[PDB]
């Protein structure tokens, strides 16, 4: 027909790089949104699994979650009720030490004044004694001093027994303070449990987060723009994680493969123009160059596409092809 053009009807649309899609979890397919031949946009849902199980699993965890928030606050009350069972309780024993210590400092000063007087009257006593021995004073004057000294002396150790008695009671109130140091130590023992509870919560929020992933993974969405080259699954099939559900072809992957009789290969060569008419698309002329030639006896020639709507091609399409001789 034309010696400028090798013409052939042995043409196959093929795909170099396709990708297999899978669910990241296992389950029962319940819906198929896309089929063999569909063009799909990155993000589209292709198919969906029954999620009830993964949703139960999540909510089984949300039960146990609120059952650990009904303990966290249960003994956040308990530990803040023992924390005020010692604050108003210690501030009271503190004032009855700051009240005994002032009541004591009142005595220790009246005791000092009395000890002042006793110092003087002791001297008078010594003197008046010596003067009575020598006949230089009446006895009336010396015993007068003597019984004054007796008064001061037993109004003294009245003050000082009234001191060692207000000092043992103080020491007792001060031991009672040490008991509350064992109180807060048992509170901190109760507190080594609160942080081990919100540590069981920290890891539960994580198990939840992971369950919500499994639930989200029940919808198979498309990782890139492409056309569905194969569909391996049907409604009601049980699939496994990572098991192929579709094959997706990157439209840039498409090429035409031509099986050329060796005879009509005369002037054909890598780089040469080529022209493809697929039966599926009468009103479109795909266009390309000869990418490579492999070493009734036909030779496979690979054609790279350079003009025409790639999103329209399907693996397996036939038609007619003209290659330019040189
Ligand atoms: Mg034809």
Residue numbers in the entry: 27 to 321, 343 to 373
What does the report in the manuscript say about this coordinate set?
Periplasmic adaptor proteins are key components of bacterial tripartite efflux pumps. Tripartite efflux pumps expel a wide range of noxious molecules, including antibiotics, metals, detergents and bile salts from Gram-negative bacteria such as Escherichia coli and Pseudomonas aeruginosa, and they are major drivers of the increasing threat of multiple antibiotic resistance.
Most either failed to crystallise or otherwise produced non-diffracting crystals, but we were able to solve the structure of Aquifex aeolicus EmrA (aaEmrA) from a construct encompassing residues 26 onwards of the 374 residue mature sequence. Therefore, distinctively for periplasmic adaptors, the β-barrel is proximal to the IM, anchored via its N-terminal TM helix. In addition, the heptad repeat pattern is disrupted by a four residue insertion in the N-terminal helix (residues 112–115) and a three residue insertion in the C-terminal helix (residues 210–212), approximately 70 Å from the tip of the structure, and close to the centre of the coiled-coil. The shifts here likely result in relative flexibility in this region, evident as high Cα B-factors over the centre of the aaEmrA coiled-coil (an average of 124 Å2 over residues 102–125 and 200–222 compared to 90 Å2 over the entire α-hairpin and 71 Å2 over the whole structure). However, the aaEmrA β-barrel contains 21 disordered residues, unobserved due to a break in the electron density (residues 322–342).
